[PDB]
């Protein structure tokens, strides 16, 4: 519910230098046509999607991956820190540790690293090769900023760790590291703003579990759905459309009755109505750190959440 | 403020053993052959009162044996030692024990070994009897149960000299002091703290006699008034999390307890005034904390600590 | 042939390695019971030392009465009784309002899993009250902990609580408190034919109680009922156990009223099957591995009317 003021200083720099900047890998050089897949600089779709919106003749660049998206993930990691500490058997990562092993100081550093997580993006390109390049860019920006301003806070091995977290390196598991796990999970929660019911509730494949089943399996239905409703309220606080949910429709989405019944068993019946986007709240979230943070601190957190610092 | 999962899988595996092998079983020194009267001291095989107190309680048709010295009581003491491990690090000159060490000299490994030992501390009980001879028999039973388990399953973690030392902590032989070793000191303190669930205001705040300090005053003089009081409130909150009655506190009532103005006044400048309301017992939470390690642990990891537990 | 879900067999493997293959621990001299000296040992009843293990080809097979072969047989019984309830106009209505036919093919899998744990908490063959309820509460909590960590993707939390309470068989829950518990209890009851007398199997103890197969007749009729009876007897045989002879002729000579043996021959009809005696290596192969136990049981033909649903 609260963020350290030094986290917000780094937030201000990241907004000015990156999250407010236009996408550059845009335009005709970066259109994609799958039958001539190498005719351009793009080798997959998405470079020209929602490059910006205009709110009251101000231009808001990278609206899907801007200040508000980035700051919401920092509230997600602070909440899931407490949720993980309420579990008897928090998930153990490939490094031997759980989210409950992170200190209150570790979560400050992790918040700083989340500021850079998508800061290296140059379009909304989605395909694998663009994704790993943009994350490399974010990781390099993080290393540079931290090694110059944040050595009083980050040791050298922590800079390497959190940069490897931002990089999302080829061959690292989702849960390679407790730090990187909490970071991927915070990013995952925010995908609810724009993914289909199938991705949010059923999992896009037979193996995959889906965003909300993942929260329920990690924190139980009670805490997990608390978190899902809290993120949905963070959407609204920052003007984004809040999708409706209807577990009635899931049997009609094209998925084998197999995966649907499993998804309804995990999640339970859910019928909650949507909300519409709001241009003014969008603009206050997107254009200033003070604007975004002030809209986010005033949203109530779950009853069980008692933030430490 | 949740403390979170602080005990590693190895410690929980031991806790499952201690529950399955000892803390879940009926007390056995309990029938007519263990009643007692000081006026026919050796009519039965008991030599003091208490063998038939609180053998079990029934909660929603489930029978919970040894509710006073069961799983919930044992687990809570592991949480107190973790909290007091941090508190001793906020202290200039923590107490130096007969081994020449303090609580602040404990490593994270020592705390893990100590937690394992605490799992057995009262696991050798065969009744609620706490008169001299039954007390020392039951703690020696606990020590031997710990030695048997450790020598078969924990030799990659306890050296042979460590199994002897921790066994000695559990035994609590006559002649042994509170503070022979830093580890045992901490074990005794965690046990002491849980006594607030069932002891009178005089033992908790003023002291049994003119000599002994009493439970909360002992916390206060080891950790300061502020850390001390936080530990007290934390323990009280753990009673509620495992469904146990939490006694009220009324520092106003202490002159009206029939003990000298001498002793009562000193207890109110150490502790300061205190008015905290009690809370009844809860049977659902009591059963959930009593019949499984998962239920008891899951209930306890949730509970807030003071913020200073988290800062290092 | 009848089939089990691969995820049920995976849990069946876990339950063999972790419980069903482990020796009983409430055994030996400290659990022997002598009725003349009721307070001599830890036991408050008889049976702790009955049939701790048998020896096949100098291999020691622990808990042979309540091991892998009994447990897996009960899973096959509930599968068959599910379809058998599916064939009845007004199948029995349990205290929760549901019948066995109200369960889905997916519920049966969850029930199958819960059945694996039904006697897995036993620490001896003791069956007197206090021992029976401790053992079923052990098995219930061992189901809980396993489900809550490896099965949240298949069990809801309400479902875990429900199936745990079925395994627990709490005091004051009726045989038919839930449709789930009813099916679980009925499957255990079928397997008691392997070891109990003609009076329990056909006439009952008292004036109020039905026999084991008068019960299967009253629920599924006479053809469906005794079809189930013979399928069980045939699962005994495939798992090496002695198949007692049946003789309706002897039933008067049993020292119980013509009242009851009258009812039995009306309900069951006349019936006389010759017995068959046990087989060590069919007992050993059904006792020592999931693969050996499953492989033996899938090869027994099901009755004509049984068409099992499972494909996913």
Numbering used by the authors:
A (entry chain A): 3 to 311
B (entry chain C): -1 to 310
C (entry chain B): 2 to 313
Q: What's written in the study?
A:
Here, we describe identification of two bacterial effectors that reverse PR ubiquitination and are thus named deubiquitinases for PR ubiquitination (DUPs; DupA and DupB). Structural analyses revealed that DupA and SidE ubiquitin ligases harbor a highly homologous catalytic phosphodiesterase (PDE) domain. However, unlike SidE ubiquitin ligases, DupA displays increased affinity to PR-ubiquitinated substrates, which allows DupA to cleave PR ubiquitin from substrates.
The overall structure of DupA resembled the PDE domains of the SidE family ligases SdeA (Kalayil et al., 2018) and SidE (Wang et al., 2018) as well as the PDE domain of DupB (Akturk et al., 2018). The three catalytic residues from SdeA and DupB PDE domains were also highly conserved in the core of DupA (H67, E126, and H189), while several loop regions differed. Varying the length of the corresponding SdeA loop, deleting the loop regions from both SdeA and DupA PDE domains, or swapping the loop region did not affect the function of either PDE domains. In contrast, mutation of the three conserved catalytic residues from both DupA and DupB resulted in impaired cleavage activity. Moreover, after 5 min of reaction, we detected a labile and heat-sensitive His-Ub intermediate on the DupA His-189-Asn mutant, while wild-type (WT) DupA displayed heat-stable auto-PR ubiquitination , which was further cleaved by DupA at later time points. This suggests that, similar to the SdeA PDE domain, DupA utilizes a histidine-based intermediate reaction to catalyze the hydrolysis of ADPR-Ub (Kalayil et al., 2018). Thus, the PDE domains of SidEs and DupA/B may share the same catalytic residues to mediate opposite reactions: PR-Ub transfer to substrates and removal of PR-Ub from substrates (deubiquitination), respectively.
